[PDB]
Amino acid sequence: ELDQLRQEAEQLKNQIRDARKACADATLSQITNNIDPVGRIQMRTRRTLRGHLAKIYAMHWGTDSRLLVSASQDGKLIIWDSYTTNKVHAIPLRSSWVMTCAYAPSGNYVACGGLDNICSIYNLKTREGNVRVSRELAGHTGYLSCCRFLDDNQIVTSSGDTTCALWDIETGQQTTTFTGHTGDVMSLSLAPDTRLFVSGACDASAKLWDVREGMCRQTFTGHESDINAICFFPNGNAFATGSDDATCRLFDLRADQELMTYSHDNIICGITSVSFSKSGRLLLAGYDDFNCNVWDALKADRAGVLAGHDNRVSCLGVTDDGMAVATGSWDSFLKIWN
Amino acid sequence: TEDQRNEEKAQREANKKIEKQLQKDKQVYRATHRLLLLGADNSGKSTIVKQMRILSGIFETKFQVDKVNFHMFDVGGQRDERRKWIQCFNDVTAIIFVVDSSDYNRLQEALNLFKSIWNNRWLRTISVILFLNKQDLLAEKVLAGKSKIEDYFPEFARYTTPEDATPEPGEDPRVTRAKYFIRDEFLRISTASGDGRHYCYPHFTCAVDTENARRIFNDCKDIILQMNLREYNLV
Amino acid sequence: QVQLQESGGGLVQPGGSLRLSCAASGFTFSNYKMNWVRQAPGKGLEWVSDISQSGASISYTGSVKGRFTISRDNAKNTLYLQMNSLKPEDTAVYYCARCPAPFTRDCFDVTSTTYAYRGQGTQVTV
Amino acid sequence: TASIAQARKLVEQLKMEANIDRIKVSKAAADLMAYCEAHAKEDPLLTPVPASENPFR
């Protein structure tokens, strides 16, 4: 029985490999062998947002391209105003070990989580006039890696216990649980239509999930170590992965196959964060050697370098109109580049 | 304009209030020392926590020595894999490593864990305070026992007690020889790498003892002394 | 897809000889440290021996210090373990394990209950 | 038995994932390139914006 199961599994794996081999038709470089190089990209620091005490672990942009939220290991959550570098709110946290933060699209709620395995929601528009805790969500058996808002009443969470979950904030209950990874899940990103989402784990694999039914449709491999960043292309038909083997890759969902790999001989350090631009031509990544690289996705040749951080870069973000790039690092500073 | 200037002045007053609060919080924050506790299940790592009378899955203890506040953490609500959440503890003052020296069939795993911690990229500038617990059990095991440290370590038949060792008032020389052999095993891999950027402090402890917080306090004083020697151009 | 498969093993008598050969695929073979682990009936996972990238530093556990010898073959992407004087205490399942990260001198999780880059194993009986 | 059930679940997952409709890589590359060229005029990061509209100047 067990031997039959193993033989059957190997046979279906062979059939899947043959189908993928047949479906492959050409290379991305051959189709992209006529476009012009993007040109040298030069960016400078425009604002230096200072005020934190310890290393910054995450950040998120509000849906106005003006407001911002930052999370630090000192145990604070500061809401900035990028235009005037003015602090709006400073929320203390019960647990200092925070690993993620989010900003609701409406702008009335802010969520956070970390090593306490609990997701906390805070309200920004209160009649009394202070930010106060609104709801604590519990049920995960491992540290929280990422959390994203769908609506004002739903949220998606990923844990280090190899699971993802969908919540209902009003009643504080779980509606669907997604399982199937072997290692810890490190990041997730929602589709533009908020109906599918992808997640990368520490087993050198990524998976696509459908929010409603609660099943896995596609699984992607190709890396040789942990994946620690993921993001969605601005059209919802591809995504990008950064791993601990000092490489980046691009995956597509309608071909179920890897498309392009960015790497260099000198680079021997991993990738911590990955984000795209508005058009989909620039890929921004941060590395353990204290700097960020700007790759041209179509040509896969490095075209920009962002330097100025004195320690490891941990978080990267881009506005919803494409007017700024925010980078945080372990030197307790946040920098805006244009 | 009118409303623009009004909202701007309200914004600056709010910003200055927040900045004052942040200055106070920094004042409070920069005067507390953080420590990370590590060990195994058989080791009595929580036992020393309760031995110190002060005493979600994260156990936090606050104690105080000579008007200096220490905050210790124990992460015990996760899975076995720990190569991802340990990177959070990179700015910690020290790592307290507890070792079960009474048993032998699991000493090699403690050696491997210590060596893995020692050679990390984000933990190569953090000092480790080593506590070899369960000395009293070791005394009984070595004295009248059938198990031999020769079988697990075939290099124990050629090692003599170093001169600098200071025996206890009354103690079998064989007990001292073996108990210092374990320490030499742990210190051999701790001095074969590094450029004097971090040190290892060993101590012998039992299941009922009191002067442990003072040991950690003295080690923290030495660590800060080294950092200040580097900082104040006095090297 | 990272893949590692063991081969060899079998049945022997006390005081015998064996050669366990581990084949690998899916990654560059000369940037990673390699280890040998085994688990016996009624026991948990335990560590035996390890070898570095080039093949200079070699580490053993004491109980097999004078008997077994490790080797790596970068050209053929293979790992080898050589057996000698098999005392009736080695009957187990043997896994060849990879360090999680390249260009790295420490292996954190190799003996975990669940680990991604670990083989299926082969059974040796003495 | 529990491991047998887990393996049976794994085989069922592979069976469910082994019958998805697929298209060629060239089509996907063409779509991505076309999208990239379609929205090239509205990316300030790639195309510098006049200094009279940049809010961080």
Add this chain to the structure above:
Amino acid sequence: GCHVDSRVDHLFPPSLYIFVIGVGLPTNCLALWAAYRQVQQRNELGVYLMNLSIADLLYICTLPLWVDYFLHHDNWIHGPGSCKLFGFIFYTNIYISIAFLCCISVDRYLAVAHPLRFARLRRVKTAVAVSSVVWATELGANSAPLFHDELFRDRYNHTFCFEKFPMEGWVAWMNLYRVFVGFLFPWALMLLSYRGILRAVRGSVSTERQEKAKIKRLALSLIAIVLVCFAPYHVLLLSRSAIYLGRPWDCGFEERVFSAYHSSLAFTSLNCVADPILYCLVNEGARSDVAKALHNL
């Protein structure tokens, strides 16, 4: 008073002063640059260092006119107010430098002997307040001779500035106060601080014998060089004050010490060259920062 004469006068002080200015100005430039780098990183020590550097620069700005005085060649320099200001600066910068050295030593002691206390006394604001108090107090205490006659054309053939052979009682008391509260008090504190630092280092279990000795050599050098540079002139000042407070009419003593009272009031201006290298350049990190700055250009 009486025709004291010398031959070394027109021989050493000039060349020694040229050496001092030429090999001291750029070094204090580098010292100021490194102190600014230090204070940028929220390190209080640099503040003190910065102030020290500034003092030395002032000394150089008042040195060239003075080598005119010892050469007896004017080139339209002489005048009452010019000397009234430049002699004041010339005679106060030494004591300001000694005070800042004492401040640096005490700050170093507070950070090695007691690394977990006095968190309030080791902030930049406290440092700047202490520095301002030091400057104001030094200027106020040393402005005593600014409200007195300075230029004295004597007989024989001279026009000394800020000194008179049959000096009055006010000069004697001023000189006495300026050798028992301007040299020996701020040096004793330095010696005690470095003794304490060495004692603390001896008991450090995390320091090898290599590094635990380079420290003893450096501290001993820093203690000894100040004495070597400053002791003879203050010894002679004490002797002259004692002679005047005893038999006042005596001139022979002055007659046989003038040939070198100056050689001392000249040797003494070598701490300005000593301090920048000993406090910035010898250290490998600061020298490496200097080399990096030079490569950056």
